[PDB]
């Protein structure tokens, strides 16, 4: 179970990154739906709660729009790129840790 | 110290988009005789600021 927890920290980080990526993809796909509210989650607090069933928050709008659509484009695109990069970083960290654990048994 | 680049560039993109929106609004309402209440339309423009928590991205203060 020690191995379980030691890899569990990074596994949960990766899982939350995947969930945030899914939400970003959803609000990209629905970017032109009138009456839509941009949704996002707070990664740090969510990870803390999971380590110690996911709630999502409404993104603060930046400009008004008559059709009731508040999901911006540039901010969420930068968020998408950042989330993808951090997901890849978590993936490679987990892979390095697993390979280091494995090669000891050789 | 390399993940702040995304924040800086995103702030720049948002500020430029806001400036473009303001310019488009001015061009559209170049010949607006009146608004809803009755007061004549007045040209608007943004006011940038340095988004330093030291230098960082650009940030729009108000209109």
């Amino acid at each position: 179970d020690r191995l379980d927890a030691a890899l569990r920290f990074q596994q949960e980080a990766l899982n939350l990154r995947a969930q945030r990526q899914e939400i970003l993809a959803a609000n990209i796909a629905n970017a032109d739906t009138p009456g839509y509210q941009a949704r996002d989650i707070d990664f740090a607090s969510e990870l803390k709660k999971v380590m110690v069933a996911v709630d999502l928050l409404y993104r603060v709008p930046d400009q008004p729009s008559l059709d009731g659509n508040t999901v911006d484009m540039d901010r969420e695109r930068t968020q998408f790129a950042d989330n993808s990069l951090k997901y890849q970083m978590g993936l490679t960290v987990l892979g390095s840790q697993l390979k280091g654990m494995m090669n000891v048994l050789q | 110290a390399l993940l702040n680049i995304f924040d800086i560039a995103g702030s720049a993109l948002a500020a430029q988009s806001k400036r473009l929106n303001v310019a488009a609004s001015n061009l559209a309402n170049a010949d607006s005789v009146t608004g809803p209440d009755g007061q004549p339309y007045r040209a608007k423009q943004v006011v940038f600021q340095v988004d330093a928590a030291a230098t960082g991205g650009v940030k729009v203060a108000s209109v």
Partner: peptide, 21 residues
């Protein structure tokens, strides 16, 4: 707060009145 941040409750509806009553 600052645009692009996160907040607990949603934005109010946006309206474009042609003439104020």
């Amino acid at each position: 707060g600052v645009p692009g941040a996160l907040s607990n409750q949603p934005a109010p509806p946006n309206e474009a009145p042609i003439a104020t009553p």
